[PDB]
Ligand SMILES: [Mg+2]
């Protein structure tokens with residue numbers, strides 16, 4: 001019954017509580033006398049022995065740079081827990097389902113992500129949570145399953161979607177003002193320039209707000225607008241990492257318009273960033289009814305940040321090899337169908353196929369596809385390997401002559417007339433339904449030959465059976 005507390009600074013703290021020397025020993029009975037533990041702004045790196053304090057109702061930890069927090073997983077009699085630090089990532093917290101008398105949970109000012117929720121949504125008696133100041137917390141819907149949750153703080157947190165909230169069984173307070181959507185867990189899109197609009201007569205660039213796909217949606221489906229201010233604090237818009245001056249911006253409910261944009265400027269556009277405020281103010285949206293009974297539901301004035309990568313290329317995708325046979329003929333049009341040649345726009349594809357592919361010399365030929373949809377076509381060309389295969393050709397003798405009542409098998413006959421194809425393709429025959437060999441005369445057996453790719457032109461052999469003396 002004397003307790004292992006490996007951290008000198010941690011034990012030092014605890015001895016100060018018991019009025020003993022900083023380096024004194026501590027007793028399973030001494031641990032059990034403890035009503036609270038408050039570690040703040042001291043470098044404590046391991047919490048072992050805590051697993052020991054079975055009687056604390058208050059654990060309060062701020063900025064201690066602990067490696068993890070595992071050892072708290074079963075303090076059944078703990079009522080109020082608080083752990084804050086810029087380094088407290090979500091992994092450092094164990095699952096908290098043991099904490100069966102916990103009413104209060106504050107993990108504010110930390111570096112948690114969404115994986116924290118599935119550790120804390122199994123808490124039976126938690127009335128309130130503060131996940132305030134966690135920028136990487138982006139969706140709070142998993143907390144709908146907690147039975148007693150009444151109050152939730154997510155101030156300054158990057159949540160964007162409130163659809164589901166009425167699922168909360170007992171919630172009457174959501175504090176959710178000033179989210180910074182895309183602040184920690186970045187939002188990026190890779191996009192075709194076709195999705196934008198360049199007008200050369202006005203020299204204007206238009207960017208449709210329909211691209212801002214992670215924008216705030218209130219619980220009832222309401223989608224607030226971006227502010228229309230072109231002040232740097234309100235809108236921060238970037239082209240190729242260069243901030244565009246307010247004087248050039250015009251903002252509507254549909255999108256944003258830049259003036260003074262040249263054709264060269266537009267073509268050179270590789271990146272945009274849209275960082276702006278959302279127009280959602282005091283008393284400007286619906287509140288669900290749960291929160292109207294003397295609670296509060298503020299989801300106001302969020303901030304949105306959205307990175308863009310712009311692609312002006314038009315690219316062509318098609319099957320990249322094909323096989324025809326030796327001397328049949330194909331028209332470029334039939335060629336393109338076969339390989340399914342397509343521009344990414346739905347414009348034209350040309351080719352040199354008629355130039356490169358030689359149908360009379362079996363082999364493999366490089367066709368290069370090209371396409372010019374644009375005012376111009378920096379449409380990089382994609383190559384296709386067209387393959388010609390040898391025509392499957394039977395060769396044989398054309399006459400053979402046998403005595404009556406000679407016995408002959410089919411395979412003997414094909415051997416006798418040196419019947420053969422150019423590729424290992426099997427010859428079929430009407431031989432044994434055409435020749436008699438009991439009755440003299442002239443019999444015409446036709447040879448044939450087929451494979452996966454072609455049928456040969458049939459060949460005739462004249463089998464003469466002569467009544468010889
Ligand atoms: Mg801004």
Ligand SMILES: [Mg+2]
Nearest residue numbers: 283284285286
């Ligand atoms: Mg109102």
Ligand code: NA
Nearest residue numbers: 106108130132
């Ligand atoms: Na708090």
